Design a protein around this ligand. Structure first.
Ligand code: MG
Length: 236
């Protein structure tokens, strides 16, 4: 009789964090981030990290747990997630792992003493996701993405080749700061990189079994999700 757990994956910008918070208000959950970039402190705007205020009312595990000068392996995620899941479970809370880093989920499922319900969200038309990706990136620039990266760029202990700087978009802003690119080239290439990420995520997901999809444009995802729980043998 393995305790319950929820997986909420999908491409970047699909609306995973949004739905997770919604679900966090419907059931006793423990939000656990599954994102290789959100682990880094000081990388909030460019990574679409939930605001300080939102995190206060929707605490996430595995967020701001590492300095940008540090590395983080899928193996460390593995141990960290298992720890967070056991801790949440002992409290009666349902582990809700939400994120788009597929290698992490993979590491957990393979390398799980839980009855896992797997959800995935994305638009039916990929063109819709691309438009959002482009617009969200432009918003990041307005919210201070460049100044955010300037602070990293100014650290002598950081360089463009580090795992943290590989977070999509950061390398482009970094090169801009090095004066290698124009503002336009930085924007376009940053959007391309993110679109490339979404493509890699769809490839992981398309061959992913036991997934219950949902539409990013749907407005009744909350009730739709709460209903699936029973299907995979889970009494909520
Ligand atoms: Mg998110």
């Amino acid at each position: 009789s393995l305790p319950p757990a929820i997986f909420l994956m999908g491409p970047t910008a699909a609306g995973k964090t949004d739905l997770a918070m919604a679900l966090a208000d419907a059931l006793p959950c423990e939000l656990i981030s599954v994102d290789s970039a959100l682990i880094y402190r000081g990388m909030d705007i460019g990574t679409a990290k939930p605001s300080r205020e939102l995190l206060a009312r929707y605490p996430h595990r595995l967020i701001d747990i590492r300095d940008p000068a540090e590395s983080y392996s899928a193996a460390e995620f593995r141990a960290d997630a298992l720890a967070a899941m056991a801790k949440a479970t002992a409290r009666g809370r349902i582990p809700l792992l939400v994120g788009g880093t597929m290698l992490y989920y993979k590491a957990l499922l393979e390398g799980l003493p839980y009855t896992v319900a797997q959800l995935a969200i994305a638009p039916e038309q990929r063109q819709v996701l691309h438009a959002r990706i482009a617009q969200r990136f432009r918003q990041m620039l307005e919210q201070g993405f460049i100044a955010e990266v300037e602070a990293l760029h100014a650290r002598s202990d950081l360089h463009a080749g580090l795992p943290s700087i590989r977070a999509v978009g950061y390398r482009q802003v970094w090169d801009y700061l090095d004066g290698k690119l124009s503002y336009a080239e930085m924007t376009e290439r940053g959007i391309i990189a993110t679109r490339q990420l979404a493509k890699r995520q769809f490839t992981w997901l398309r061959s992913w079994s036991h997934l219950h999809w949902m539409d990013s444009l749907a407005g009744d995802n909350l009730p739709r999700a709460l209903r699936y729980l029973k299907t995979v043998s889970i009494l909520a």
